[PDB]
Amino acid sequence: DKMTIEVPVLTFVPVQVSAELENRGCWVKFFDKKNFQGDSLFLSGPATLPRLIGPFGYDWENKVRSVKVGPRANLTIFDNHNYRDEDKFLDAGANVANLSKEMGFFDNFRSMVLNCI
Amino acid sequence: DKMTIEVPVLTFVPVQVSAELENRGCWVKFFDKKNFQGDSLFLSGPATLPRLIGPFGYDWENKVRSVKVGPRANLTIFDNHNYRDEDKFLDAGANVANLSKEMGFFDNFRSMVLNCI
Numbered sequence: 001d002k003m004t005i006e007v008p009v010l011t012f013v014p015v016q017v018s019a020e021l022e023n024r025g026c027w028v029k030f031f032d033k034k035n036f037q038g039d040s041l042f043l044s045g046p047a048t049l050p051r052l053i054g055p056f057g058y059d060w061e062n063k064v065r066s067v068k069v070g071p072r073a074n075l076t077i078f079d080n081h082n083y084r085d086e087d088k089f090l091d092a093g094a095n096v097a098n099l100s101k102e103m104g105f106f107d108n109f110r111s112m113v114l115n116c117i
Numbered sequence: 118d119k120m121t122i123e124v125p126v127l128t129f130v131p132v133q134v135s136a137e138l139e140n141r142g143c144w145v146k147f148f149d150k151k152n153f154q155g156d157s158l159f160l161s162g163p164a165t166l167p168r169l170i171g172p173f174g175y176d177w178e179n180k181v182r183s184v185k186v187g188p189r190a191n192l193t194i195f196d197n198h199n200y201r202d203e204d205k206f207l208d209a210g211a212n213v214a215n216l217s218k219e220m221g222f223f224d225n226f227r228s229m230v231l232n233c234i
Contacts, residue, residue, distance in 0.1 A: 004131075006131065006132045007132075008129040008130065008131060008132075009129065009130050009131070009132060009134075009135040009159055010127070010128075010129055010158060010159065011127075011128055011129075011130055011135060011138070011158070011159040011160065011161060012125040012126065012127055012128070012158070012159075012160040012161065012164050012166075012171070013125065013126050013128050013130070013138070013160075013161045014121070014123065014125060014126070014161065014162065014163055014164065015123045015124075015126060017126075017138070017161060018126040018128055021128070021130070021134065030172075030173070032172065032173055032174075039172040039173070040172055041127055041128075041129070041171075041172045041173050042126055042127065042128040042129075043128065043129040044128060044129065044130045044131065044134060045131065046131055047129050047131065049129075054129070054158075054175075055149065055156040055157055055158045056147070056149060056156070056158050056175075056177040056180040056181075057177065057180060058171075058173075058175050058177075059174075060173040060174065060175070063173040063174060064173075
């Protein structure tokens with residue numbers, strides 16, 4: 001669906017703030033290891049990313065191995081950059097311990113849209 | 118100053134949330150280029166970082182060229198990791214168009230403490 005036009009802001013925040021954001025329900029957590037292990041990148045929705053990059057040379061393609069989607073969030077991932085080609089849809093509450101093509105997704109999605117519901 | 122013991126959370130937040138945090142005043146913006154040009158990393162305090170890294174292989178040492186300190190923040194950067202060796206303190210509202218030793222700072226600070234006032 002149509003969404004606000006803006007570029008998500010990469011930011012470090014205290015735990016109090018992320019907890020607050022997490023409680024709102026529109027979020028996603030990307031883990032670098034399967035089964036939600038390892039450190040994770042947290043995204044508060046909505047977020048439209050044609051490329052998995054960020055300020056200061058941040059490039060996190062080929063890192064995500066597992067995902068958790070908030071209760072009030074919808075996540076759409078694409079196989080190529082710029083929301084191009086095949087897509088996969090993860091509904092609220094989704095928990096994918098093994099984000100791979102073999103488990104029904106992609107081995108390395110390259111763009112995404114996080115929408116709040 | 119004794120602060121909360123926690124690890125800052127790397128997050129992508131929507132402009133609205135970002136604006137709210139900036140409004141609270143305890144923030145710092147690190148720019149990729151001198152004179153506040155290019156993209157920047159936004160940090161909302163408090164934040165204690167013994168290393169300039171983040172989830173998913175984020176490593177931003179040798180990146181910050183300029184800085185802006187919020188109206189309600191205090192920044193202290195260290196020349197070495199783990200808050201070691203020489204330090205430079207920046208008062209609230211402070212700005213550094215050229216972060217380097219020449220300008221009386223460091224060419225590549227490696228740890229920092231962002232406290233709120």
